Amino acid sequence: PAVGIDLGTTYSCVGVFQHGKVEIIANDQGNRTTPSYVAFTDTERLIGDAAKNQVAMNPTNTVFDAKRLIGRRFDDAVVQSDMKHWPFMVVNDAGRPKVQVEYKGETKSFYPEEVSSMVLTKMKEIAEAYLGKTVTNAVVTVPAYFNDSQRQATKDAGTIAGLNVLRIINEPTAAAIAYGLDKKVGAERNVLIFDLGGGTFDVSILTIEDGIFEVKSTAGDTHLGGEDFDNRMVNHFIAEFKRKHKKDISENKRAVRRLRTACERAKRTLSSSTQASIEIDSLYEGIDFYTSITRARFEELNADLFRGTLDPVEKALRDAKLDKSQIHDIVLVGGSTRIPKIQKLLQDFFNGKELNKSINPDEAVAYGAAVQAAILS
Ligand SMILES: Nc1ncnc2c1ncn2[C@@H]1O[C@H](COP(=O)(O)OP(=O)(O)OP(=O)(O)O)[C@@H](O)[C@H]1O
């Protein structure tokens, strides 16, 4: 019994290979991914959906984005940057970051590694409930840009969770495995993995020859993701509200919220229809907001940001010393890759090359990991 675990920044996912097929395991709540969140309350510690779904009530003691800290030193540029966005306290313990919370009435602190071991204990359990067996063997994946210390902190995290880590595998390599690209035979191939999520955006170029993988270059954008596509919708609709009602909803938090949630939803809908309607009663000062947006207007609100996703592509290709002619395969992972327009720019840019995108983009990392875990076991 061996699983693959995508230990994620925001969401984690676990997969098992059985009856010749990966099954992606739903959690106790029915969800096939699970927030990488840990909440400390007056009485208990919650993990997964229970934790995410009380953030508003208890933000000070709800820890998330631990992958951002795992295996890093306190004065790491990434630690210092992100801290300004987290409501829980990050503490400097003699060079290493720690997360300070109130737990069962007590001040408590946790290395990011411990917090990530909590998520993995939950993922382990998710598979044990599916399977009606104890699970211990896992393949766990990390980012291609993880240095030794971060890889080690991540293995140590699986070990504390009672896991036998068969292997630590880069996320893009896991995704290439899911499409059986390690099975192709003959000459070497260059493969680009385009991974666009909610905040993260990671591009990776790998070499594959005879099943044997090699990272060639990596490139990122900390400031491009789906949240940014939603912002442009909010701005568009807040200006629509003003043109029609001469009222400014921007100073009302709950109104802005109802509108963002709706946008975020209508976005997902535009990924597979050509228009989305939104009706929100009494959105602001008793004023109803019924509107609609087309795919076209959506893409247009975002045309510069879509195009902008091609720049980490060009950095990645130039560090890897390859013309974009010599890329054989493009693999799409991360939820934002579902946006048809983004798929279209990528197909045109890699005119005549194959886009692998048919496995659920939020599940491909865990899919290939699960595939490889069954092999190593
Ligand atoms: N059908 C869809 N169309 C457009 N965007 C989508 C769709 N489904 C999900 N998304 C977007 O994908 C984004 C998040 O994807 P993902 O689950 O990869 O988050 P993430 O932060 O990358 O997770 P992790 O940090 O664990 O990688 C959200 O911004 C969401 O709106």
Number of C-beta neighbours around residue 63 at 10 A: 26
The answer, yes or no, to whether any atom of ligand 1 lies below 6 A from the CB of 227, is: yes
**Of 4, 35, 1, nearest in space to 22 by CA:** 4
Bridge partners of 225, per DSSP, are: none
221 Cα to the center of ligand 1, angstroms: 15
183 as an active site residue: the answer is no
CATH of 64-118, one of 1.20.1630.10, 1.10.150.530, 3.50.50.60, 3.30.30.30: 3.30.30.30
Interatomic CA distance for residues 326 and 320, integer angstroms? 11
CA 297 to chain centre: 26
Domain with CATH 3.30.420.40 in the chain: 1-63+119-183+357-377, 184-224+309-356
Interatomic CA distance for residues 318 and 324, integer angstroms? 9
Number of C-beta neighbours around residue 13 at 10 A: 28
Domain with CATH 3.30.30.30 in the chain: 64-118
The answer, yes or no, to whether any atom of ligand 1 lies below 6 A from the CB of 229, is: no
CATH no. for 1-63+119-183+357-377: 3.30.420.40
Question: Whats the size of the chain, residue-wise?
Answer: 377
Question: What angle do the packed helices 253-270 and 226-245 form, to 10 degrees?
Answer: 120
231 Cα to the center of ligand 1, angstroms: 14
In contact, 133 and 103? CB cutoff 8 Å: no
6 as an active site residue: the answer is yes
**Of 160, 300, 174, nearest in space to 232 by CA:** 300
Domain with CATH 3.90.640.10 in the chain: 225-308
CB-based contacts of 302: which residues, under 8 Å, 6+ apart? 228, 229, 232, 341
The answer, yes or no, to whether any atom of ligand 1 lies below 6 A from the CB of 366, is: no
Sign of CA dihedral 222, 70, 338, 226: negative
**Of 88, 227, 174, 203, nearest in space to 363 by CA:** 174
Q: Which two tokens stand for residue 218?
A: 């990596």
Give the burial class of 274: count Cβ atoms within 10 A of its Cβ; 0-12 exposed, 13-18 middle, 19 or more buried.
exposed
Is 198 annotated to bind a ligand? Reply is yes
113 as an active site residue: the answer is no
The answer, yes or no, to whether any atom of ligand 1 lies below 6 A from the CB of 111, is: no
The answer, yes or no, to whether any atom of ligand 1 lies below 6 A from the CB of 267, is: yes
Task: State which approach was used to obtain the coordinates.
Answer: X-ray
**Going by CA atoms, what residue is nearest to atom 16 of ligand 1?**
197
Q: Which residue out of 171, 202, 230, 329 is catalytically annotated? A: 171
The answer, yes or no, to whether any atom of ligand 1 lies below 6 A from the CB of 8, is: yes
CB-based contacts of 161: which residues, under 8 Å, 6+ apart? 117, 118, 120, 121, 124
Sheet holding 201-209, edge to edge: 212-220, 201-209, 189-196, 327-333, 354-356
| Cα dist from 162 to 24, 56, 120, 158, 235, whole Å | 21, 31, 9, 7, 47
Resolution, given in Å to one decimal, reads: 2.2
In contact, 219 and 312? CB cutoff 8 Å: yes
Atom nearest to 270 CA in ligand 1? 3
Is 9 annotated to bind a ligand? Reply is yes
Interatomic CA distance for residues 98 and 188, integer angstroms? 44
**HEC states along the chain?**
CEEEEECCCCEEEEEEEECCEEEECCCCCCCCCEECCEEECCCCEEECHHHHCCCCCCHHHEECCHHHCCCCCCCCHHHHHHHCCCCCEEEEECCEEEEEEEECCEEEEECHHHHHHHHHHHHHHHHHHHHCCCCCEEEEEECCCCCHHHHHHHHHHHHHCCCEEEEEEEHHHHHHHHCCCCCCCCCCEEEEEEEECCCCEEEEEEEEECCEEEEEEEEECCCCCHHHHHHHHHHHHHHHHHHHHCCCHHHCHHHHHHHHHHHHHHHHHHCCCCEEEEEEEEEECCEEEEEEEEHHHHHHHCHHHHHHCCHHHHHHHHHCCCCHHHEEEEEEECHHHHCHHHHHHHHHHCCCCEEECCCCCCCHHHHHHHHHHHHHC
CB-based contacts of 262: which residues, under 8 Å, 6+ apart? 278, 280
Task: Find the largest Cα–Cα distance for the chain.
Answer: 66
198 Cα to the center of ligand 1, angstroms: 5
In contact, 244 and 287? CB cutoff 8 Å: no
Interatomic CA distance for residues 255 and 50, integer angstroms? 25
CB-based contacts of 169: which residues, under 8 Å, 6+ apart? 139, 140, 141, 142, 177, 368, 369, 372
In contact, 191 and 331? CB cutoff 8 Å: yes
In contact, 142 and 7? CB cutoff 8 Å: yes
CATH no. for 225-308: 3.90.640.10
The answer, yes or no, to whether any atom of ligand 1 lies below 6 A from the CB of 226, is: yes
CA 349 to chain centre: 24
Q: Which two tokens stand for residue 309?
A: 């996703």
Is 8 annotated to bind a ligand? Reply is yes
Residue 191's identity, in one-letter code, is V
Is 200 annotated to bind a ligand? Reply is yes
Q: Which two tokens stand for residue 205?
A: 């170029």
Q: Count CA within 13 A, CB hemisphere, residue 343.
A: 17
The answer, yes or no, to whether any atom of ligand 1 lies below 6 A from the CB of 199, is: yes
Report the CATH superfamily, name and number, of domain 184-224+309-356: ATPase, nucleotide binding domain (3.30.420.40)
In contact, 12 and 124? CB cutoff 8 Å: no
195 as an active site residue: the answer is yes
In contact, 357 and 367? CB cutoff 8 Å: no
Is 336 annotated to bind a ligand? Reply is yes
Interatomic CA distance for residues 116 and 8, integer angstroms? 10
Q: Mutate which of 170, 268, 293, 343 to test ligand 1's pocket (most atoms within 8 Å of Cβ)?
A: 268
Q: Mutate which of 11, 119, 274 to test ligand 1's pocket (most atoms within 8 Å of Cβ)?
A: 11
